[PDB]
């Protein structure tokens, strides 16, 4: 009985108060920590760098003047969402930029971290490797192995609707003609 | 991965939504993915990261959803936010009377609920009034009862479990009461005899066995249910009894992880759990399924208590979805077709106040629209009853608007001179006490065949669910005569609410002053 | 981090101030920050770093504030400095009498408190004196009582829990007493029968069930409550009975961390804890809410004992704030509108002396000002009663100043020749025994309709809380006649303290020597 008290007691008793705004900085830094550093070095090497804003992502100097049309975004689960409500947007151009809205709940919950990591993966596939065309036959080979496999819901997990309708096996030409879908997967 | 409540599921999963899903032969717990779990018909669970059992009943959040649990807990209570507990009431099927020449009548019982309504089960029997014997007018004389005599009471009862979890050892004590406070008898708590199980929606003893005889037939009391004359008089005037039962159930059956054995632990006892459930959940009463009062409890948040604010917010619509079976074929709430709009919402005064507030900060007047935006707090009591029927003081279905009654009869499968064989929706035939048959002369006369208040029970039910009305039953065992192939044959139905149960002031037995609704009127040639 | 009391919360936090606050779905404990916590409406807790339970009752400092606790403990007792314990007293609803023609009267009971007042619960019943039957003048004759006869007593009672914690197994033994020391009977402690729960502010058995019959109705004693003639005489002159009850409650319900189960531990019993609470807390009695004596205990320091000096200093103002609900809309202590100045402060002789000292080192004379500077020590007894009402020896509300009584009636919702339908503040109609109605001739005559001492109960209450005075009740079932549309109709009210309970010396039944307050006077045409 005395044993159990210790774990619950520790989880509940915050000895000292970090502060009102420190928590935000510590949360974001911990989040970016989990991604392999080498990705960050590749990102810096190709130019623009991630900056964490605090307010409504819809209104920031870097993004207000560019890409006004793309107000419609789709989260990782495929559901639509408007940019103002969304808590993270990224943009591909001469200045690759990634903007993240500060919040205190990235360590505690997980659904928000998934969207952030999804955007880092999108920057990695579309902006870094694309300069070297790194996704290629090995990736195509695994990809192709997923479509044709015993009742593997894996497709449902990684393929969009457009892919579930290519009747035959994947071809090296298709990636060339269509390169947004594969980069998404 | 942290897990403070120590219930198997990690924190983030419990707070955000999770689901268990069997991957070929092994079951593992996974975070809810919107697209891959939804097409598979899996339910999105939520729970409290700081409660070993969010509902507060004796089964852990993990056990409920994984199935490691007493296989008797009803399916709908497998969901972590629906409290699983027993609800036992007593149903008396028929009685018999004599003097310390035996009046043996069949009774019908219904679980009741009346009005500031509180958490204690009671039922209510109604004794059949129709005259099984022709010559048995006035009970006071059919039994040679004198001013200084005493009658003997001998009834048959069974226990019904309409809750969601099984009871094991004990069986509840329950006291019969006539009138307001005249306690005729308290049914003993038989000892070491309920070694069987009462699973939800079951009877004890089962439908296959003789029902438990109330009088012992031994020497415990010569006539335990004695009853002076005056009681018998009140009973004759009212024809109804009450059965109040308390909540002293047995112990609890728990699941053992070491070997998967389900053993009844003698330490845990339902009389310690029920108060918790009763003080931290919202209560919903529904009479939709078969016109019986089904009570469910859903775990709702209580602002005043830290530990209690942890439970996931419950919107009324979601409560109905997971507790009873309402669904959305086209996004419109309905229970096997009947849209949510055919039901009334009644609330206790506290809850009423709270909901008026909720309707004010949303600027809405029709609850049926903003339904998915109403927050449930702890301790609300909500009563959802079908809007189409009239109801009495004890919230039992008792009558209805005439128009519904007529449409329910417009399908004449067959008609002859011996009676009708209809096919009516099983729910309506629970508010019709009987039928008045009459014949109409081509010039407006009126001849009522069964022209006695206690001669209405002429409608039986065939083994294929077709109702058949027999004229020869309370006739002279003779077929139906018609004085003119142009004479109309009229049939009236009498709903329960509008019935008479005793002879009038001057002992009138004719069906004159009874409000009768027309159900049939065909030509003599047509019959 | 050190933590000697071994109660989860660290030392510094307990001494300086902390608070529990739910962060979206996870609850955590934090040191009080003045600026960021105050806007959120969170309470600043304090406690003793060397006491596993500052109040000394069986729930840890941590359990109370975190909510991990028997969900039945009343809200006001969740705060670490307010002792949670039961207070059970017996309420008798009505009695009946006969001889071994049965006088069956309804009774009203009030939990009492008298003066050097001690820690033991007792109540006091008052039998209705009004004549339900016209012809039943003089009880001595309505029951054929002879010098050598004996009457039998058969009452109905319910147990009331007005404390702050639940009792579980036992129900207290309690002895009825007439006069100063004549014990008529001791109500047995039924065995293994109170398997239900008495949560605070509840009745056993609930208001929806028959009350527990006092007489067994079995063979234990033919008439357990025998009572010689002389006894019956004292009762006829006084109509008062006392119900003394002891403190033998059951076991205690404890919280299990492993699974969150609340189990009744058979080792811990309230009869071992109450003494601790009673010797280390200050006791405050308040009759503010509904004119009933509500007792609360707050943990205060006791200078003589080292371990006890550890408890946070308690100022009177905060005690009232956290124990009963007083607040500061504009910095003025008030309970739902009524300013703190409308209440009396009475103190036992010890406490009186101590507070006189406290008023001396501060050089103040009116305590209502320096309220936030009065330290509470252990063992003080304070009685706060409404200043507006007159009180009897047992601190029950018994009367009032005439001006208040008149002001309470200045709202005539309707007036006719059949009675008044008023809407009066629910509290006043508990100090008015009845009304004398009279009609006044244009020249000063006086005709009193109900001109008998035992004919005052003419005021009923409608289901919407509107008081209705019926003239035809104790009239001749006839409307009210007026000999002149200019004749004034006067109505007087008689408060309890000024009422008569028995016929006078020469058996006068007239309302002559009764102090009557004029309450109404409208001419014949103003009706």
Automatic annotation (TrEMBL), chains B, C:
Q: Does the keyword Metal-binding apply?
A: no
GO annotation, biological process: protein homooligomerization
Task: Provide the alphabetized UniProt keywords.
Answer: Plasmid
GO terms for CC?
extracellular region
Q: What name is this protein filed under?
A: Protective antigen
Question: What are the top taxonomic ranks of the organism?
Answer: Bacteria, Bacillati, Bacillota, Bacilli, Bacillales
Of the parent protein, the shown chain spans 176 to 735 of 736
């Amino acid at each position: 009985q005395e044993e159990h008290l210790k774990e619950i007691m520790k989880h509940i008793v915050k000895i000292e108060v970090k502060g009102e705004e420190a928590v935000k900085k510590e949360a974001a830094e911990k989040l970016l920590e989990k991604v392999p550093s080498d990705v960050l070095e590749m990102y810096k090497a190709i130019g623009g760098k991630i900056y964490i804003v605090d307010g409504d992502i819809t209104k920031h100097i870097s993004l207000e003047a560019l890409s006004e049309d793309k107000k419609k975004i789709k989260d990782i689960y495929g559901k639509d969402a408007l940019l103002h409500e969304h808590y993270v947007y990224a943009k591909e151009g001469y200045e690759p930029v990634l903007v993240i809205q500060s919040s205190e709940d990235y360590v505690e919950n997980t659904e928000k971290a998934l969207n952030v990591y999804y955007e880092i993966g999108k920057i990695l596939s579309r902006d870094i490797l694309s300069k070297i065309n790194q996704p290629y036959q090995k990736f195509l080979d695994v990809l192709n192995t997923i479509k044709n496999a015993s009742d593997s819901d894996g497709q449902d997990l990684l393929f969009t609707n457009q892919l579930k309708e290519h009747p035959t096996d994947f071809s090296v030409e298709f990636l060339e003609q269509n390169s947004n879908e594969v980069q998404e997967v | 991965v942290p897990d403070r409540d120590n219930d198997g599921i990690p924190d983030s999963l419990e707070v955000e939504g999770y689901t268990v899903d069997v991957k070929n032969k092994r079951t593992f717990l996974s975070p809810w993915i919107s697209n891959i779990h939804e097409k598979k018909g899996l339910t999105k669970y939520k729970s409290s990261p700081e409660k070993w059992s969010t509902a507060s009943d004796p089964y852990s959040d993990f056990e409920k959803v994984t199935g490691r649990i007493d296989k008797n807990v009803s399916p709908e209570a497998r969901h972590p936010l629906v409290a699983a507990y027993p609800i036992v009431h007593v149903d008396m099927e028929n009685i018999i009377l004599s003097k310390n020449r035996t009046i043996s009548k069949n009774t019908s019982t219904s679980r009741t609920h009346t009005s500031g309504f509180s958490n204690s089960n009671s039922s209510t029997v109604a004794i059949d009034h129709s005259l099984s014997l022709a010559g048995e007018r006035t009970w006071a004389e059919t039994m040679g009862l004198n001013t200084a005599d005493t009658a003997r009471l001998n009834a048959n009862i069974r226990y019904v479990n309409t809750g969601t979890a099984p009871i094991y050892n004990v069986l509840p004590t329950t006291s019969l009461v006539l009138g307001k406070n005249q306690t005729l008898a308290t049914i003993k708590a038989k000892e070491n005899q309920l070694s069987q199980i009462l699973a939800p929606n079951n009877y004890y003893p089962s439908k296959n066995l003789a029902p438990i005889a109330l009088n012992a037939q031994d020497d415990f009391s010569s006539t335990p249910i004695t009853m002076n004359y005056n009681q018998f008089l009140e009973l004759e005037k009212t024809k109804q009894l009450r059965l109040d039962t308390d909540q002293v159930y047995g112990n609890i059956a728990t699941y053992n992880f070491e070997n998967g054995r389900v053993r009844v632990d003698t330490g845990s006892n339902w009389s310690e759990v029920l108060p918790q459930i009763q003080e931290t959940t919202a209560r919903i009463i529904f009479n939709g399924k078969d016109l019986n009062l089904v009570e469910r409890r859903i775990a709702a948040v209580n602002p005043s208590d830290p530990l209690e604010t942890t439970k996931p917010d419950m919107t009324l619509k979601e409560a109905l979805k997971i507790a009873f079976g309402f669904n959305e074929p086209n996004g419109n709430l309905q229970y096997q077709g009947k849209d949510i709009t055919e039901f009334d919402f009644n609330f206790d005064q506290q809850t009423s106040q709270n909901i008026k507030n909720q309707l004010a900060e949303l600027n809405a007047t029709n609850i049926y629209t903003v339904l998915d935006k109403i927050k449930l707090n702890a301790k609300m009591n909500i009563l959802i009853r079908d809007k189409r029927f009239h109801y009495d003081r004890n919230n039992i279905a008792v009558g209805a608007d005439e128009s519904v009654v007529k449409e329910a009869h417009r399908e004449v499968i067959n008609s002859s001179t011996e009676g009708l064989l209809l096919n009516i929706d099983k729910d309506i035939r629970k508010i019709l006490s009987g039928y008045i048959v009459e014949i109409e002369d081509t010039e407006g006369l009126k001849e009522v065949i069964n022209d006695r208040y206690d001669m209405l029970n002429i409608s039986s039910l065939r083994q294929d669910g077709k109702t058949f009305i027999d004229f020869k039953k309370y006739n002279d065992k003779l077929p139906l005569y018609i004085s003119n192939p142009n004479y109309k044959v009229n049939v009236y139905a009498v709903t329960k609410e509008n019935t008479i149960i005793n002879p009038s002031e001057n002992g009138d037995t004719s069906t004159n002053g009874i409000k009768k609704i027309l159900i049939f009127s065909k030509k003599g040639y047509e019959i």
